[PDB]
A paper describes a structure:
The chaperonin TCP-1 ring complex ([name]) acts as obligate folder for >10% of cytosolic proteins, including he cytoskeletal proteins [name] and tubulin. Eight paralogous subunits (CCT1–CCT8) assemble into a hexadecamer of two back-to-back rings, enclosing a folding chamber. This architecture facilitates nascent protein recognition at the apical domain with a built-in lid, as well as binding and hydrolysis of ATP in the equatorial and intermediate domains to drive lid closure for open-and-close conformational transition. We trapped endogenous human [name] with substrates ([name], tubulin) and cochaperone ([name]) at different folding stages, for structure determination by cryo-EM.
Intriguingly, another symmetry-relaxed 3D class (20.0% of all closed particles) presented additional density within both ring cavities, clearly different from the first class with tubulin. Another canonical substrate of [name], [name], could account for part of the density, into which we indeed built an [name] monomer on the basis of its detection in LC–MS/MS. ACTB and ACTG1 differ only in their first ten residues, most of which are disordered in our model. Our model of [name], positioned similarly to tubulin, depicts a partly folded monomer coordinated by specific interactions with the ‘CCT6 hemisphere’ of closed-[name] state. Subdomains 1 and 3, known as the ‘barbed end,’ are well defined in the cryo-EM density map. Subdomain 1 is localized close to [name] and CCT6, while subdomain 3 extensively contacts the hairpin termini of CCT2, CCT7, and CCT8. By contrast, subdomains 2 and 4, known as the ‘pointed end’, are more disordered, making less contact to [name] than the barbed end. We therefore identified [name] helix H1, helix H3, and its preceding loop, in addition to TXND, and built their atomic models into the cryo-EM density. Upon reaching the level of the CCT2′ and [name]′ apical domains in the trans cavity, helix H2 is followed by a loop region and helix H3, which traverses 35 Å latitudinally to the other hemisphere of this cavity close to CCT6, reaching the C-terminal TXND. This TXND fold, highly conserved across all PhLPs and superimposable with the PhLP2B TXND structure, contacts [name] through the [name] apical domain loops, and partly through the flanking subunits of CCT2, CCT7, and CCT4. Altogether, this ternary complex structure confirms [name] as a binding partner of [name], and depicts [name] as a molecular ‘strut,’ anchored to the [name] trans cavity, while reaching out to hold and stabilize the [name] folding intermediate in the cis cavity.
Numbering used by the authors:
A (entry chain P): 1 to 22, 45 to 212
B (entry chain d): 61 to 120
C (entry chain b): 2 to 526
D (entry chain e): 2 to 78
E (entry chain q): 251 to 399
F (entry chain h): 182 to 362
G (entry chain e): 156 to 387
H (entry chain d): 241 to 420
The structure:
């Protein structure tokens, strides 16, 4: 404007004319957290806490039912179609295509061995690329495929895109949770 | 030469100067490769080779 | 009515339907654009193009190879895509003729545009073009000559063909040098056509004349640490074994014990297994061991203590080339040494090239594999030199397979055009006119060859046409002085395979592009 | 012509019968037949030039730009 | 098992015999049920393919009620007891009906447990009607009449 | 059509296939059953495609090498036991196949998959096999041919096998269809 | 007449069909092979013609005139080892859907190693499995093997050593076509392999395509192949 | 370390671990104690087989799979009075061996005195509060290898010092070939 817009009455008249536009609750606390206090909760709260505790117990028992395998296993190419393309309905599958030769592949396999026990709900498999794919290129490993209902959800391919030899058991976990497979509780730190 | 990042380079080497300053022109990139070849084959003379090339072309 | 210019549009948002004249318009302009792009690279005095890619890397290439140029361009015209694929297929079939076929197809389509303007159906045109293709095939086949019987004359034809292929390329500076290289490189295959056997190492630095074809073989891999560095009268085991934390393929197998002592015993057993493997290897009586896969620290130590040079990580291609050059057998089991053939070379040393060390196998046994070291001042020079060498080697392999040769310099095109002209003047109707246009395109090939040098293309092609009408079936362009000459004497000969494929693929693509009267595009993704 | 039911009630109260009746279209009677016939005539007149030995081809380009040259009516359509 | 079950095989014989043992067990269970005289079984949970196979073999009509209230009301209707085990029922735990059949009321398929006596613990009113809204209104009227009773 | 249904006149007992191509008068009714070919494996073309009085085994059985159970874990400490376990899986499958073969059934239909091993087995015995058959088509095959659907192959009597005067696999307008007539 | 002795009315029909297409440049050459194809694969009692028995393969290169009918099969593979021979005449073929690898149960299995003797037993078990597979393939008399699921270094080298050219990673449909054409039966395991389950092919060849590095496998000269391929 | 015998090992000094998936299954407290006891015994036997050769400086290659140096192994090596330097990189191995004359040992069985390198001193010298260097001074059978330590007051003059020295070396190289 002609003058600097500040705490003055002139700008205000201009504006009026039309110029110069102007712990929360037991609902979230887990099984461990619920035990932590127990006494804190008032009995009137404890009545609905009984229902929420039964709900959390039911959910935990459901997850127990869902944790079928919890360990890394190796499939040959021949049965690949049954193990990956026709895995459990809605079951997240992570396939590590690797050769024992490449050390980065062994590092990724160790990290997957840890994550398998950490994530017993997700299916973790590993396979020799030459034995899964006819003539899989040598310089194209490790290959981390993320599958759901037979459909590829993600593909971290390459000895460079995967995240370098400094790859701890954390950044790989985040990369696998990128497609929402393992569902970790953190962010990409490194 | 302050590259895309905060990496600084004070240099008198022709190969280093050329490969540190992205040139964005096919002939200039060829001159970068020329300085690289001189650095490989000889190791010093990487400015002289580039100057000779530029001079031969200015003569052409 | 019409599909698009109808009161109701029948298409999804983003589609379109070019009709008769508009379809031929887009087709002809696109094909002729492709052709005018790839010409000026044609012939000895052809000039290169820059392939300044716009990607995040901005790759840079300098090429005279029509196939590469067309592959590396963003085409959106469908007819242009047809010509591009045609040049790719030419490059796959043989290694030369991608620019000659592209230019020929483009000129045929230019003449077809002219004929359609004359109010001729492109069926009469395609019919006449098929008749002309027949006549041209017979004229080519009749002019072809075979010299594979006479060994010396065959060597001369091979040298001449390699020279003619490299003439158009950046290697014409040192043509003779590279000609010899290419010939030797194709003769070291001993009849085989495996071009994967010919390895080309591009080492930056040095002049282009510093390039050579190694009498032995070179490998860009490493020797182990405590292992020898020089070996005379080398006995070689080429292998594809594990030697890398080698695990028994039973995958359910797991070590499950109750004492770390047993874990240590089993670890010792693993190490003893690897040692026994190395001992089985050494029972072959070897001094050099080449493994396709890695070689971990313990087998490295064992081979070093045994005095064996263990070259590791050689790839499938590396081990195949080593088997071809030394005579060995790629092995993965060593329980029957009497059946495993070893490789032999008089010497395995380490050599310096530029700033990198390489394993040098000299005095090799078979030699049916090669290594050519290409030196150059720029990576672009090296890439173009390798591409040109690939061209020359592909053509020489195709000739060793089929020793039929046909003279170049426009002699072949002019001869085919003469046959088409005879057919045309003896044929009644507008098919004669389409035959005449076929002949004009054939003539327009040497015309362009001459233009690219700066000579009187019209004068020279007129002289050539008059000569080939007179009966001098060997008249062609002499591009040193810019005259007409005898291709038989000057050594300007091409592979009959290459020229026939050029003709047929060009005529075929022009036919398929001419049959189009409607282009129905779909909504781009 | 289109836009299905358009009355908006005689009294003045809203008349909403079909979901998105305002965004929806409708063609009724002989004009619908004529539209059908024009569409079919366009398709047929496109195809009739690819009929017989002297029939010409069509060059189809897909979403990602791949080219298919053909005379087969099924492949074209 | 409620805790967790793993079939721990250590011999080819156990592997060869496990599935045969499973089916033989299922056959035994369903044959004990059929030999108690039961011709109709009503399960509140899921049905297995082998158990269904053997129910068909021994001519038993299988009905699956997803809801638990439906199961309780059926028990009240027929005079039965919901068994938490797959053990054959005792003479008291069994229920009886003059008829149990599959019928098609209109487009709808229905399973009917029908007594002939003009009594019972539960009675059903099958409302026919040309509109879901009409039938809901008539159901409200029925509720009014029943609450009046 | 409706004069063949028994007493409930079930619509699920009348099959209606739609095979694109052909004229309305080319449509037809089959006093029997017909259904489309179902994802055959290798060896299905080695099988025969016409039978003149076949006996038909209708099954709810997965015929392929599979984990004996999903919660099953084998534990061995000997390579002889390893070999025995491999051969045991194979004998389990081959025993199923041998029972199916000795029932006299020349046609085999499974509501569940039939693997490549079983496909080739039946092809070698000159039998026909079709897996992943839909439940409704299986029930129609049952009500037409006159057998029962078996989840176990251990009692395959002629009482539970089905029978028709002709079985064929023919082409119907680009599709392949199996006809029990 | 739809007989195989007078194919002229059928070549005329096929030529009429192909008159309107770009391949009329080799008009009769194309029509003839279409006729022969349908005549090779057909229950000619006015019965059906299953087109799955006709493999229509195309490879850029060459000329339209090179398009031909192979009374057999073409595969997009080559021999597993680069030093195996590229031609096999009077080839006895063992068709296998078992990867030439140590056996593995489909059920979740854990083989426990508890001693150095267990480790050495495992080691020799692996060795002997590889040798026993190759010996079983040799004892049937086969001169060529065709697997569907690929194999490993030990098996590949043992095949080479025992003069057993072999193809791996052949697809289920191609495995089926090879079986149908050669008269062989598809075998799921080596123990079930016999000299009667083998197919016979009068020629198995590896074919190149110029400057490509791409190889194809042709199986032909079978006796009465009920399968066929049209190579374009 | 004076009169230094140096050994470069490519194996790991930590609890046993097979190339396969190994486990130690405990079902009695006796096994629980025996596990730690036998682990200590394994590690101690390793460090004893190293000490017995007279080695007092120990370079250990880098291992990313399993721990190349357990704290127990470090304790034992310290009590044996052996300087230990881990995290040696797999690319410096040929260089280190060419410099000192050591031979890389990948299996404890072959860790003999004949696989060591005799240097006249091996020290860790401080660079006046600007880091530390592990310098080995003197070497019997000295190799065709040399190291240049480049100091400087800023990373830019250091980088150009390195480049300038490289230019001088490449000049002398241009002189060794084509002696003109
Ligand atoms: N000395 C020469 N005199 C006349 N013509 C030549 C001579 N050398 C090469 N040629 C011609 O130059 C052409 C080179 O073509 P080239 O660029 O390789 O075409 P393309 O890329 O299509 O293979 C050949 O067609 C050949 O006829
Ligand atoms: Mg050329
Ligand atoms: Mg037609």
């Amino acid at each position: 404007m002609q003058d600097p817009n500040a705490d003055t009455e002139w700008n205000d008249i201009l504006r009026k004319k039309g110029i110069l536009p102007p712990v929360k609750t037991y609902e979230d606390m887990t099984l461990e957290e619920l035990e932590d206090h127990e006494d804190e909760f008032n009995e009137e709260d404890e009545r609905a806490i009984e229902m929420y505790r039964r709900r959390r117990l039911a959910e935990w028992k459901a997850t127990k039912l869902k944790n079928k395998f919890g360990e890394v296993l190796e499939i040959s190419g021949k049965d690949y179609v049954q193990e990956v393309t026709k895995a459990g309905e809605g079951l997240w599958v992570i396939l590590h295509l690797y050769k024992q030769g490449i050390p980065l592949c062994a590092l990724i396999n160790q990290h997957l061995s840890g994550l398998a026990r950490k994530f017993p709900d997700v299916k973790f498999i590993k396979a020799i690329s030459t034995t899964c794919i006819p003539n899989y290129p040598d310089r194209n490993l490790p290959t981390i495929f993320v599958y759901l209902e037979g459909d590829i959800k993600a593909q971290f391919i390459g000895p460079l895109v995967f995240g370098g030899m400094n790859l701890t058991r954390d950044e790989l976990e985040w990369k696998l949770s990128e497609s929402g497979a393992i569902m970790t509780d953190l962010e990409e730190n490194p | 030469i302050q590259d895309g990042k905060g990496d600084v380079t004070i240099t008198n080497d022709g190969a280093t100067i050329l490969k540190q300053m992205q040139v964005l022109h096919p002939a200039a990139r060829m001159l970068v490769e020329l300085s690289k070849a001189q650095d490989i084959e000889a190791g010093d003379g990487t400015t002289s080779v580039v100057i000779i090339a530029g001079s031969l072309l200015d003569s052409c | 009515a019409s599909l698009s210019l109808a009161p109701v549009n029948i298409f999804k948002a983003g589609a379109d339907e070019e009709r008769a004249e508009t379809a031929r318009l887009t087709s002809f302009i696109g094909a002729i654009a492709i052709g005018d792009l790839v010409k000026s690279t044609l012939g000895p005095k052809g000039m290169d193009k820059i392939l300044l890619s716009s990607g995040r890397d901005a790759s840079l290439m300098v090429t005279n190879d029509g196939a590469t140029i067309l592959k590396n361009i963003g085409v959106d015209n469908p007819a242009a895509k047809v010509l591009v694929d045609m040049s790719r297929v030419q490059d796959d079939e043989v290694g030369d003729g991608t620019t000659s076929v592209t230019v020929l197809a483009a000129e045929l389509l230019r003449e077809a545009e002219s004929l359609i303007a004359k109010k001729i159906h492109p069926q009469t045109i395609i019919a006449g073009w098929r008749e002309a293709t027949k006549a041209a095939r017979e004229a080519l086949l009749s002019s072809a000559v075979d010299h594979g019987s006479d060994e010396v004359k065959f060597r001369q034809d091979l040298m001449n063909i390699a020279g003619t292929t490299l003439s158009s390329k950046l290697l014409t500076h040192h043509k003779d040098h590279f000609t010899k290289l290419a010939v030797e490189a194709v003769l070291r295959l001993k009849g085989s056509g495996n071009l994967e056997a010919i390895h080309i190492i591009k080492k930056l630095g040095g002049s282009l004349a510093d390039s050579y074809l190694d009498e032995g073989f070179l490998l860009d891999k490493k020797i182990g640490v405590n292992q020898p560095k020089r070996i005379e009268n080398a006995k070689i085991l080429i292998a594809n074994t594990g030697m890398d934390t080698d695990k028994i393929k039973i995958f359910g197998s797991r070590v499950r014990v109750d004492s770390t002592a047993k874990v240590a015993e089993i670890e010792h057993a693993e190490k003893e297994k690897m040692k026994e493997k190395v001992e089985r290897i050494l029972k072959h009586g070897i001094n050099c061991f080449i493994n396709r896969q890695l070689i971990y620290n313990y087998p490295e130590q064992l081979f070093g203590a045994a005095g064996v040079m263990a070259i590791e990580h050689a790839d499938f291609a590396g081990v195949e080339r080593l088997a071809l050059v030394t005579g060995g057998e790629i092995a993965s089991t060593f329980d029957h040494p009497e059946l495993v053939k070893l490789g032999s070379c008089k010497l395995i040393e380490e050599v310096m090239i530029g700033e990198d060390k390489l394993i040098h196998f000299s005095g090799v046994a078979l030699g049916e594999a090669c290594t050519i070291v290409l030196r150059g001042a720029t990576q672009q020079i090296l890439d173009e030199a390798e591409r040109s060498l690939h061209d020359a080697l592909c053509v020489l392999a195709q000739t060793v397979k089929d020793s039929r040769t046909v003279y170049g310099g426009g002699c072949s095109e002019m001869l085919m055009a003469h046959a088409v002209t005879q057919l045309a003047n003896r044929t009644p109707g507008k098919e004669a006119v389409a035959m005449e246009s076929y002949a004009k395109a054939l003539r327009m090939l040497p015309t362009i060859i001459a233009d690219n040098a700066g000579y009187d293309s019209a004068d020279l092609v007129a002289q050539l046409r008059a000569a080939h009408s007179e009966g001098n079936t060997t008249a062609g362009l002499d591009m040193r002085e810019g005259t007409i000459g005898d291709m038989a004497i000057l050594g300007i000969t091409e592979s009959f395979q290459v020229k026939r494929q050029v003709l047929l693929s060009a005529a075929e693509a022009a036919e398929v592009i001419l049959r189009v009267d409607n282009i129905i595009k779909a909504a781009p993704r | 012509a289109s836009m299905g039911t358009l009355a908006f009630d005689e009294y003045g109260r809203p008349f909403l019968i079909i979901k998105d009746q305002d965004r929806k279209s409708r063609l009724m009677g002989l004009e619908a037949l004529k539209s059908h016939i024009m569409a079919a005539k366009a398709v047929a007149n496109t195809m009739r030039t690819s009929l017989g030995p002297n029939g010409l081809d069509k060059m189809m380009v897909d979403k990602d730009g791949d080219v298919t040259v053909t005379n087969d009516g099924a492949t074209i359509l | 098992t409620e805790t967790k079950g793993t079939v721990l095989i250590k011999t080819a014989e156990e592997l060869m015999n496990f599935s045969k043992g499973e089916e033989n067990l299922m056959d035994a269970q369903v044959k004990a049920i059929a030999d108690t005289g039961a011709n109709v079984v009503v399960t509140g949970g899921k049905v297995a393919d082998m158990a269904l196979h053997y129910a068909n073999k021994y001519n038993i009509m299988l009905v699956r009620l997803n809801s638990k209230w439906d199961l309780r009301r059926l028990c009240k209707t027929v005079g039965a007891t919901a068994l938490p085990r797959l053990t054959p029922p005792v003479l008291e735990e069994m229920g009886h009906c003059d008829s149990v059949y599959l019928s098609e009321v209109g487009d709808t398929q229905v399973v009917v447990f029908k007594h002939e006596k003009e009594d019972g613990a539960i009675s059903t009113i099958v409302l026919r009607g040309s509109t879901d809204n009409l039938m809901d209104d008539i159901e409200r009227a029925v509720d009014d009449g029943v609450n009046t009773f | 059509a409706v004069m063949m249904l028994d007493d409930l006149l079930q619509l699920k007992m009348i099959g209606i296939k739609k095979v694109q191509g052909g004229a309305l008068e080319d449509s037809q009714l089959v006093a029997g059953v017909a259904f489309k070919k179902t994802f055959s494996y290798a060896g299905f073309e080695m099988q025969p495609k016409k039978y003149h009085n076949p006996k038909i085994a209708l099954l709810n059985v997965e015929l392929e090498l599979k984990a004996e159970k999903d919660n099953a874990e084998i534990r061995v400490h000997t390579v002889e036991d390893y070999q025995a376990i491999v051969d045991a899986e194979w004998n389990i499958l081959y025993d199923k196949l041998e029972k199916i073969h000795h029932s006299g059934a020349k046609v085999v239909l499974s509501k569940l998959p039939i693997g490549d091993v079983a496909t080739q087995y039946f092809a070698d015995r000159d039998m026909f096999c079709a897996g992943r058959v839909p439940e409704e088509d299986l029930k129609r095959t049952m009500m037409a041919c006159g057998g029962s659907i078996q989840t176990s192959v251990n009692a395959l009597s002629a009482d539970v096998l089905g029978r028709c005067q002709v079985f064929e696999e023919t082409q119907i307008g680009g599709e392949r269809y199996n006809f029990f007539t | 007449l739809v007989d195989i002795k007078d194919t002229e009315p059928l070549i005329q029909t096929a030529k009429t069909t192909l008159g309107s297409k770009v391949v009329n440049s080799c008009h009769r050459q194309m029509a003839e092979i279409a006729v022969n194809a349908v005549l090779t694969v057909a229950d000619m009692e006015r019965r059906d013609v299953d087109f799955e028995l006709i493999k229509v393969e195309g490879k850029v290169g060459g000329r339209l005139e090179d398009t031909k009918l192979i009374k057999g099969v073409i595969v997009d593979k080559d021999f597993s080892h680069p030093q195996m021979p590229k031609k096999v005449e009077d080839a006895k073929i063992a068709i296998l859907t078992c990867p030439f690898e140590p056996p593995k149960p489909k059920t979740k299995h854990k083989l426990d190693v508890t001693s150095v003797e267990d480790y050495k037993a495992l080691q020799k078990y692996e060795k002997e499995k590889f040798e026993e597979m190759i010996q079983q393939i040799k004892e049937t008399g086969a001169n060529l093997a065709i697997c569907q699921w690929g194999f490993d270094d030990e098996a590949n080298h043992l095949l080479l050593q025992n003069n057993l050219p072999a193809v791996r990673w052949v697809g289920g449909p191609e495995i089926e076509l090879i079986a149908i054409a050669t008269g062989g039966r598809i075998v799921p395991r080596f123990s079930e392999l016999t000299a009667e389950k083998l197919g016979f092919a009068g020629l198995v060849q590896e074919i190149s395509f110029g400057t490509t590095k791409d190889k194809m496998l042709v199986i032909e000269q079978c006796k009465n192949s009920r399968a066929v391929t049209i190579f374009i | 370390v004076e009169k230094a015998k140096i050994g470069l090992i490519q194996f790991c000094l930590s609890a046993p671990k097979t190339d396969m998936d190994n486990q130690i299954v405990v079902s009695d407290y006796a096994q629980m104690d025996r596990v730690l006891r036998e682990e200590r015994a394994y590690i101690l036997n390793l460090v004893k087989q190293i000490k017995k050769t007279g080695c007092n400086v120990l370079l250990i290659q880098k291992s990313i799979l399993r721990d190349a140096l357990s704290d127990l192994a470090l304790h034992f090596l310290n009590k044996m009075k052996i300087m230990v330097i881990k995290d040696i990189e797999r690319e410096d191995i040929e260089f280190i061996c060419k410099t000192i004359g050591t031979k890389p040992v990948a299996h404890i069985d072959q860790f003999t005195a004949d696989m060591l390198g005799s240097a006249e001193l091996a020290e860790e010298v401080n660079l006046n509060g600007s880091g530390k260097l592990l310098k080995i001074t003197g070497c019997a059978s000295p190799g065709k290898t040399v190291t240049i330590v480049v100091r400087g007051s800023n990373k830019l003059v250091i980088e150009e010092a390195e480049r300038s020295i490289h230019d001088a070396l490449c000049v002398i190289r241009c002189l060794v070939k084509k002696r003109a």
